[PDB]
Amino acid sequence: VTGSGKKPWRQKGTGRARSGSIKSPIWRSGGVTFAARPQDHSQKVNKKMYRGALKSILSELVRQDRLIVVEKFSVEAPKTKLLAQKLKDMALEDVLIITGELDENLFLAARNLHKVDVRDATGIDPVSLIAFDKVVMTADAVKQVEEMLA
Amino acid sequence: MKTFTAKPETVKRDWYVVDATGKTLGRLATELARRLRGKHKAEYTPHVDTGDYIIVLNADKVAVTGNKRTDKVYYHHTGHIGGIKQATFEEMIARRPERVIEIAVKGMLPKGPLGRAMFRKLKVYAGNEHNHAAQQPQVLDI
Amino acid sequence: MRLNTLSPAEGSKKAGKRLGRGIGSGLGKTGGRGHKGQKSRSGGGVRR
Amino acid sequence: AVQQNKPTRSKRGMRRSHDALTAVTSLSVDKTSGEKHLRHHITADGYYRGRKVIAK
Amino acid sequence: METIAKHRHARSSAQKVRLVADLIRGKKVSQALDILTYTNKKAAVLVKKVLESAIANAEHNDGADIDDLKVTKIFVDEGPSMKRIMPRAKGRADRILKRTSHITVVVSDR
RNA sequence: GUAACGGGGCUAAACCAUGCACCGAAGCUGCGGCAGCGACGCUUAUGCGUUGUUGGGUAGGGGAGCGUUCUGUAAGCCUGCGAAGGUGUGCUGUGAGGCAUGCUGGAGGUAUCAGAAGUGCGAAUGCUGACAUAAGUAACGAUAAAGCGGGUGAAAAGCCC
RNA sequence: CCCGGCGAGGGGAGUGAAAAAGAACCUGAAACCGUGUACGUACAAGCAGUGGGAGCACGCUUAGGCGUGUGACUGCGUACC
């Protein structure tokens, strides 16, 4: 705290409580006893524990019928209208789409759709799988996930 | 239900006359205090004056056992530095006999505003005559 | 399986002591340090 | 020299029970001028007991 | 109908003014004016002006009459206090409060 | 200042012996309720049929919770048909508390389950601001001194003549 | 427009969804200071409460002896850290 280290008033003689610094935490306009510092909140996750969690999450999705598997998923042109129409045909609103190779056309079409996300097989994360109501994975995507999880 | 409590506006108080001639001072005072407080009534309530009006006659002829007639001393302080004054039982009887019974009963009554009110129902007379015939007091052989 | 339906295993998330926060907590007014002495002071205690 | 305890607002009011002002019981009326005035005092217009004392 | 007149931030402590206010509470306006006229207090001058203002308000804004008006309500509330410094002996400084008051007078034909 | 029964008073209302009653505690019992720890019906994804027993508490140890701000759940839900906050009332739990609603307020609030703490104040001759108290009391700063007429003014002991 | 000293400060009028948003201006808590109303209080002694409790006032609501405010009198009772 900006300020001098001078003692505000002498130790004895005055009828005031002893003070030693104008920056004392007890005082207004200076303090914070345990002022925070920038810190890293990251936690370690064992490789096996992370893989085990993904396997459990995927197993739950198939159990709850939240995992849809299709031979392929693509759009003719990079237009949000085409992707939105396609999702309506399949009756999907909040969907996470996983593909073997993230097509540029599909990626652009889904960018403006708030409830639609497109990822590659290697981009899946535990939170995304749980967060989205439905998960759509292509046949190729299932293959890569299988090898990655082993 | 709630226990019965006497109401001061509906409590019935009777008038009695007691002859103090030859009666032991203390043993007469206890009965007077008991009746002044109303302890003899089934409707007795600690916070209500349910007692009876009592007239005491011949207060100057109250009796005391032993040598108390000349040995009992009544002390009181006037509030000044000397203050302390005393009077024997004989001196009190000669000077103001009614105070002998009044002092005895007052000590036996409860202390506080209520006890002071109960004391007001006691009428002590030195002689054998009282001017409360209008109240039709009943003879009490106490 | 939703972000608001996951719970930790029982007995794996103990709360943690909070000293000097009232009589009810059982750790107020010297928070387990006892009374006057070197050990009760801030930074007090003897070396290894 | 100084108090050991803070006196109460009740005590403050009790002391001030004698601070109330007293209004004049009544005002005299000049017999001729007819205006009100303090008894034994001249009126605002210079009259007193209907004699028209100096009013300049 | 009751008419209100107020003098806010009057330069006088509420305690001093309340002494005069108690004199005329509940009195007829004609009687109240006489009382204030012959009260030798500064607050009397202040209160009289407020009372006269209330009387004028009743006429102009309500069409009332003096003969029926009376001081139904009157009170003084503490206003903001001005802080001042008073030098004392040996270099000590003292705080002076220049207290103000809000004077309210209500006149009704009741 | 009685002042060596607490008092009144007591010749028993004192003392000794004997006897029978009664008063007397948060002790014991009765009735209702809560909780901890044990064993029993392998009962039960366990509450009990029950069953005994325990529950004063500082330093201190152990166990279980309330509420506050913030992140996800939440582009959800509540909200100008009135949010937060403020102030009442009613109801409710063993407690920290919770729920509903009148008035004020005039735009934000946030379930649930998790996550993180600048997470709870009456005290430290604590810190800042506000406001009391003494009190309408002390004081109004050299005891060189003022009086009157007129003027001005809403108002003159203090200004002008 | 009106009172006021061609004041200060107010009362109307008008603007505005709102002026109890009027510039001493969003919300407007507490200490503290007032006005009004109900009840208590001038023969009574002390941590000011608690248990009991009359009276009064007020609200009831299908007399229903209930709620709310006050608290004469009375048992017990020497704050907190």
What residue type is assigned to position B136 of the chain? Q
| Sign (positive or negative) of CA dihedral A42, A43, A44, A50 | negative
Q: Are strands E70-78 and A116-120 parallel, antiparallel or unpaired?
A: unpaired
How far apart are the C-alpha atoms of D33 and D46, rounded to whole Å? 10
Please report, as a single letter, which amino acid is at residue D17. S
Options 3.90.470.10, 3.10.20.30, 3.60.15.10, 3.40.50.720; CATH of E1-110:
3.90.470.10
Do B125 and B17 meet the contact criterion of CB atoms below 8 Å apart? no
Cβ–Cβ under 8 Å, residues B55 and B15: yes
Q: Is the dihedral of CA B104, B108, B112, B114 positive or negative?
A: negative
Helix (H) / strand (E) containing A148: helix A139-149
In contact, E17 and E29? CB cutoff 8 Å = no
How far is it, in rounded angstroms, from Cα A107 to Cα A98?
Answer: 11
Closest-approach residue (CA) in chain C for A57: C1
Element (H or E) spanning B75, and its range? strand B73-77
Instruction: List C-alpha distances in Å: A25 to A3, A18, C29, D31.
Output: 13, 14, 20, 81
Query: CB contact, 8 Å: D44 with chain E?
Result: no
Which conformational region is residue E6 in: left (phi greater than 0), alpha (psi within -120 to 50 degrees), or beta? beta
Q: Are A40 and A67 in contact (CB under 8 A)?
A: no
User: How many other β-carbons are positioned within 10 Å of the β-carbon of residue B67?
Assistant: 9
| Residue from A94, A86, A87, A85 nearest A66 by CA | A94
What does the domain layout of chain E look like in residue ranges? 1-110
Dihedral angle, C-alpha B38, B44, B48, B49, nearest 10 ° = -10
Q: Do D42 and D48 meet the contact criterion of CB atoms below 8 Å apart?
A: yes
D20 to chain E: which residues are within 8 Å by CB? 19, 22
As a whole number of angstroms, the distance between CA A136 and CA E10 comes to 79
CA distance B88 to A89: 122
Fold assignment, A1-149: Ribosomal Protein L4; Chain: A; (3.40.1370)
Interchain pair C1, A127: CB under 8 A: no
Concatenated DSSP letters of A29-73:
TS--TT------------HHHHHHHHHHHHHHHHHTT-EEEES--
| Spatial separation of the C-alpha atoms in residues A137 and A117, rounded to whole Å | 12
DSSP secondary structure, D1-56, as one string: ---SSPPPHHHHHHHGGG------S--EE-TTT--EE-TTS--TTS-STTS-----
Residue E53 CB lies within 7 Å of the nucleic strand G: yes
- Which residues of E participate in the annotated binding site? 90
The Cα–Cα gap between B38 and E22 comes to: 50
φ/ψ (deg, to 5) at E19: -60, -45
Torsion region of C14: left, alpha or beta (phi above 0 gives left; psi -120 to 50 gives alpha): beta
Length of chain D: 56
Give every CB contact of residue E33 below 8 A, 6+ residues apart in sequence. Answer: E48, E51, E52
- Could you list the residues of E known to form a binding site for L-tryptophan, using ranges: 90
Q: What is the DSSP string of chain E?
A: -EEEEEEEEESS-HHHHHHHHHHHTT-BHHHHHHHHHT--SHHHHHHHHHHHHHHHHHHHHH---GGG-EEEEEEEEE-PPEEEEEE-GGG-EEEEEE--EEEEEEEE--
Chain G nucleotides with an atom closer than 7 Å to a protein C-beta:
1-4, 7-12, 24, 32-36, 43-45, 52-55, 72-75, 81
Beta carbons of B33 and B108 less than 8 angstroms apart: yes
Q: How many angstroms separate the Cα of D9 from the Cα of each of A18, D13, D14, D15?
A: 34, 6, 9, 10
Query: In terms of Cα–Cα distance, which of E100, E98, E85 is closest to E46?
Result: E100
End-to-end CA distance of chain D: 56
Chains D and E: how many Cβ contacts under 8 Å? 19
Q: Please give the Cα distance from C45 to E68 (Å, whole number).
A: 86
Residues with Cβ within 8 Å of residue A74, at least 6 apart in sequence: A103, A105, A106
Report whether E29 contacts E67 (CB < 8 A). no
What Å distances lie between residue B99 and A32, A112, B53, B103, CA to CA?
Answer: 78, 109, 18, 6
Element (DSSP H or E) covering residue B39: none
Handedness of CA B97, B98, B101, B104 (dihedral sign): negative
User: What is the three-class DSSP state of A124?
Assistant: coil
Residue B134's Cβ-count burial label (10 Å; 0-12, 13-18, 19+) is: exposed
Phi-psi region of A49 (alpha: psi -120 to 50; beta: other; left: phi over 0): alpha
The answer to whether E93 touches E87, Cβ cutoff 8 Å, is: yes
**Crossing angle of helices E42-62 and E29-37, rounded to 10°:** 150
β pairing state of E2-10 and E70-78: unpaired
Q: How close are the terminal C-alpha atoms of chain E, in Å?
A: 8
Q: How far apart are CA B67 and CA E63, in angstroms?
A: 93
Strand B73-77, strand B84-88: pairing: antiparallel
CA separation, residue A19 to residues A7, A8, E84 (Å): 7, 6, 28
Distances B20 to B17, B27, B92, B124, E100 between C-alpha atoms, Å: 10, 11, 16, 10, 73
CA distance E23 to E44: 10
3-state secondary structure of B11: coil
3-state SS, residue C2: coil
User: Who's near D43: CB < 8 A, 6+ residues apart?
Assistant: D30, D33, D35, D36, D37
Resolution, in Å, please?
Answer: 1.9
Contacts of E49 (CB under 8 A, 6+ apart): E7
Contacts of A84 (CB under 8 A, 6+ apart): A113
Written as one string, the DSSP assignment of A17-36 is PP---TT-TTSTTS--TT--
- CB within 8 Å of A88: residues ≥ 6 apart: none
d(CA B42, CA B11): 12
CA of A71 and C1' of G68: distance in angstroms? 78
The residue with tokens 């009554």 is B109
Per-domain residue ranges of chain D? 1-56
Length of chain A as a residue count: 150
Q: Domain limits of chain A? A: 1-149
CA E4, E8, E14, E17 dihedral sign is negative
Chains that touch C (3 or more CB pairs under 8 A): A
Cα-based angle D49, D50, D52 (whole degrees, multiple of 5): 110
